[model samples]
Target: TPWSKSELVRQLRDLGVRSGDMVMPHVSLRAVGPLADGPQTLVDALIEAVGPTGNILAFVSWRDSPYEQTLGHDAPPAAIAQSWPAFDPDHAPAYPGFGAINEFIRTYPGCRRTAHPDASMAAIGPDAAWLVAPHEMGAAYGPRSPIARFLAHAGKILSIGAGPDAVTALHYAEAVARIEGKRRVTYSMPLLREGKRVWVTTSDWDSNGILDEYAAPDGPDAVERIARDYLARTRVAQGPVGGAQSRLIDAADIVSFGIEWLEARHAA
Candidate 1:
């Protein structure tokens, strides 16, 4: 039979998309081939696969370059102010690198995007608030992050046409492990404070290697190595989602493995 949204859900299920499961999926929209209804169809299929009792989540990251002064930030102290407007949870644009699905889903009716200036998460389900809230500013991907909160629930992290590198959940382990070569990042973001514009600084792990392409004090991230090393023994499963390769991992297993893995690899 030809493909349809219904087939999308079925293949995803065979690939481990489960009902009542809290899921965090990162996808490459193009790899999924074409949906009969464009982006919304795949998004709907994901929501459907997770079902009424399940909550599906996506990492809704925003482009940080605007605040980085790459465009222009060499101005003197007191002479520099926020060059951009405050981030609004209701309207900030999603990072294009994260995938078009993220931006689309956040705009989807009833989707809830968290208020964090960066490293925000968007979700749809009864537990949406539970996942996205409390994305602590200083602990971007640390113990207090949405991914960390999701870990407590032992949700599954899904990757469609993606790899371990995109798993934000592992950063929680990095925070807890405090392994050697780990580093912290600090930067400012523009956000509305009361009625005036404010520049809020956030400091957290270099989880995504979003920082530190320059000097090296931080060790190389072995997240993909962790995945390659652990998959067979850890209940990590894989299959096809549309035209793309996919993986579904037990959130708790990865987090647990990550802690030990980091500890052993880069001990202090």
Candidate 2:
């Protein structure tokens, strides 16, 4: 059944999302049923639940690898159909009820976004201040991909999944702290932007198809152990590094982290 705006608000409230907390919510449109009031209803519910001080950072992941077509490799089609623009009132599947939450936030004096059209970040009130990192990635940043610009500075992160891999925030932490022997790495790839060809540095290694080169499967438990040990060992290491940060939390302790995160940061 489609979730009503009020119902969604209840869901967030139940999760402990409170007013004024900066929320970086990654959503799966397909997970939610067709909108009764449309996407804006969900946005409104989120805002109302969090209050004026809280801001929602939602994304409709819709990007495809230009290389798929360029290299003639068969790749899964991008989810362009789920694009926000497509749901905009002016477009087909036009949900006049669904206003661009990003735009609405911009109009709010205290609300702002992370700066990337595809990858977006938004926050409200003091919570918004947490995102004031001096640097971020080129895709997130823009023309001046400052080498050392702070990316996201939020104190608390919330994710809806079983583990860290489900939440890419940990990856950003790896890039920022530059864990020893894990300094940030970059790859060059041709991407289509505004009908033009451009080369860009991307952190998405999967898209580049290099996982097979360095990723070794030691078994199901082996992968878990590796992830746990890596995160635990590198939490305090210096330099932009990779692997994992074990000290941050245990991969097995997913439920606890989610609960604690909601209580501390998402509490409404």
194-257: candidate 2 lDDT, tens digit per residue: 5444444444323111123223434232123334444454442121001111112222233233
lDDT of each residue in 150-198, candidate 1, tens digit only: 8888788889887666777777777788556666666665665565766
RMSD in angstroms, candidate 2?
12.3
Output the lDDT of residue 197, model 1.
65
Per-residue error (Å), model 2, residue 164? 5.2
Model 1 residue 88 lDDT score: 77
> TM-score of each candidate?
0.87, 0.45
In Å, residue 121's CA in model 1 sits off its true spot by 0.7
- What are the per-model C-alpha RMSD values against the true structure? 3.5, 12.3
lDDT for position 184 in model 1: 65
Prediction 1 global C-alpha lDDT: 0.74
